[PDB]
């Protein structure tokens, strides 16, 4: 019994570590290094990643936040605050009457019916027109930032995240981490920034006499190394027998030329490797008209082989036909930088991409990169679920009111925990009112009355004025996946913590 009452303290104190950082208006906190240094941090993530704790429950409940942030990328502290608020002042009575299993059973159906109620209300939005998506994105990036060419960044973000799309494997699936790379190069006007249909690499050809400007290439992607020695297998075997060395160097030529002929049996205009290239292999290639690029990273091969134009299965050796034939555009080598840059551009339906932007200084480039990264995250989240739900705490109040009506409707035996959750779910509007700077009790009573009589289909609260206004003319909306994920994650973390 005393285990739960001991573990709840760590959870509530970690929840209270950061609580006033939510919303537009927020405070800032200070950390003090043991030597004497001072850092004044605003991010919730930085604080809940730096301080280390002891009790295992606190460690697990910290790890949940980062694990969730790894995937969705939108909401981190809200689930922590909601879980702490629910845990603190709901279950301690029910423990005083010694019925934990009844509480869990009530929690399950409470989750089910609140999820159903949330699914009941929704408004669909069309996806054909991009202007209203741009407007929604602009409203979403109203978060604290610098408005320097924000519209351009939003437009490029929308274009890239729409172009990556999906390949009809396991229904719609959008990935942004692996098929989008940002590259920044100083010099030139900031207007020239745009999305590039192909892909850029920072390396160049291995010999000056090979052709560079090619039209309609036929690319082959190949792993492993062309050279083959395998010396470590046979070392110092009858050192006095140099005839063995002569014979092995003679027979290796047969293997090298066999590999070269097997490759050359097709028309692979370009050859990309990763490990290295010897002299016989490049000499044989240069006997014909082929170009080679050496030692590219793994991720670059992942982008290129991802239907950037060069549809290739990336087979190590003994390839087949139709696994090399590809439809691409132009291959070029540029001298824009001190190092030569490779361009494989003007392809068809390229599933990969490469986004580049230009600016005089580097720090403004870093800021612009952060801005468009956030925009891309939001736009990816939107396309998966094309329905929206009003925010500002109105949804929470409506759900709580519906739960109270149901509790007074059927009036089950275990209705007390149900009501406890119902009027313990309303912590967010109280925090918003407290941060605004007005009286909590009167505003909460007015909101309850409005939800009772007007049902508050879109009426909510304003975080910059503190007055009850309708959100139809305000324009505040949020997607649907984030709320469901937050509510679920809170439910199972509470159940898991109570199960011990």
């Amino acid at each position: 019994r005393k285990v739960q009452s001991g573990n709840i303290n760590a959870a509530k104190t970690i929840a209270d570590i950061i609580r006033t950082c939510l919303g537009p208006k927020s405070m800032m906190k200070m950390l003090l290094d043991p030597m004497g240094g001072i850092v004044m941090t605003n991010d919730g993530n930085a604080i809940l990643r730096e301080i280390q704790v002891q009790h295992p429950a606190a460690k697990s409940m910290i790890e949940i936040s980062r694990t969730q942030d790894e995937e969705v990328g939108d909401g981190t502290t809200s689930v922590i605050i909601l879980a702490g608020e629910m845990l603190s002042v709901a279950e301690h009575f029910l423990e005083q009457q010694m019925h934990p299993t009844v509480v869990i059973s009530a929690y399950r159906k409470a989750l089910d019916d609140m999820i159903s109620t949330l699914k009941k209300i929704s408004i669909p939005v069309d996806i054909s027109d991009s202007d209203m998506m741009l407007n929604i994105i602009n409203s979403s990036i109203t978060t604290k930032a610098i408005s320097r060419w924000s519209s351009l960044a939003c437009n490029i973000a929308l274009d890239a995240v729409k172009m990556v799309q999906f390949e009809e494997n396991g229904r719609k699936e959008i990935d942004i981490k692996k098929y989008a790379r940002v590259e920044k190069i100083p010099g030139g006007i900031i207007e020239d920034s745009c999305v590039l249909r192909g892909v850029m690499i920072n390396k160049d050809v291995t010999h000056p006499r090979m052709r560079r400007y090619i039209k309609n290439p036929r690319i082959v992607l190949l792993d492993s190394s062309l050279e083959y020695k395998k010396g470590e297998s046979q070392t110092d075997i009858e050192i006095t027998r140099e005839e063995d060395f002569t014979r092995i160097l003679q027979m290796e030529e047969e293997y090298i030329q066999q590999l070269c002929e097997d490759i050359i049996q097709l028309k692979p205009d370009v050859v990309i490797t990763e490990k290295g290239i010897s002299d016989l292999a490049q000499h044989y290639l240069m006997r014909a008209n082929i170009t080679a690029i050496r030692r590219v990273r793994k991720t670059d091969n992942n982008r290129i082989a991802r239907a950037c134009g060069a549809r290739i299965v990336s087979r190590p050796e003994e390839l087949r036909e139709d696994d090399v034939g590809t439809g691409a555009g132009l291959l070029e080598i540029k001298k824009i930088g001190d190092e030569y840059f490779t361009f494989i551009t003007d392809c068809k339906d390229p599933k990969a991409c490469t986004i580049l932007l230009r600016g005089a200084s580097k720090e403004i480039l870093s800021e612009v990169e952060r801005n468009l990264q956030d925009a891309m995250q939001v736009c990816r989240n939107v396309l998966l679920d094309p329905q929206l739900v009003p925010g500002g705490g109105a949804s929470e109040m409506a759900v709580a009111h519906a739960l109270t009506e149901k509790s007074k409707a059927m009036t089950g035996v275990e209705q007390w925990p149900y009501r406890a959750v119902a009027q313990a779910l309303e912590v967010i509007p109280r925090t918003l009112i407290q941060n605004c700077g007005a009286s909590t009790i009167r505003l909460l009573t007015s909101l309850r009355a409005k939800h009772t009589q007007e049902n508050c289909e879109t009426w909510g609260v304003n975080g910059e004025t503190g007055t009850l206004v309708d959100m139809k003319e305000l324009g505040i909306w949020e997607p649907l996946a984030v709320k469901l994920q937050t509510y679920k994650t809170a439910v199972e973390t509470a159940v898991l913590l109570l199960r011990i």
């Binding site: 850092v39 930085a46 730096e50 280390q52 002299d279 016989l280 720090e363």
Partner: protein
Amino acid sequence: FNEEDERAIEMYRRRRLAEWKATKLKNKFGEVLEISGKDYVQEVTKAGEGLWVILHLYKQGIPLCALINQHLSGLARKFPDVKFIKAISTTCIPNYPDRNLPTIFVYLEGDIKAQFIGPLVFGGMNLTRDELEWKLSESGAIMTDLEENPKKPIEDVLLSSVRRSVLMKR
């Protein structure tokens, strides 16, 4: 024709004959080794010049010299061409304070490098392996990857804002 191919073959013959003076089986190591006696410096120093060693001094009591051993062994498996040693507080330096217990550093032949002292450099209860390869690879023995430790550079809002304001409109 017969000129270029024969010339290429003969540079292979010359290069392969020049490579006949290669190493002398220096890959004996590749696993974790432990010593605990009076074998202080007569073993670590007495080796070939082209080695890459790493020593370690601990106490076995505090639960920070038990986490680092797993990471060190994991690096031992991946990299075969290095030397790894362990000891318990008494091989050298007969008296040693408990203030800076986990002591890890790299000898070179005649001149030590990259002295790591004290628990503050590691952080504490947060050493993921990647930070360990990064710290060890800041001086040689680099395998790949960069900028994998954002947890150290926390952003200071006020100073960074002042710098951005003074730089953007300068």
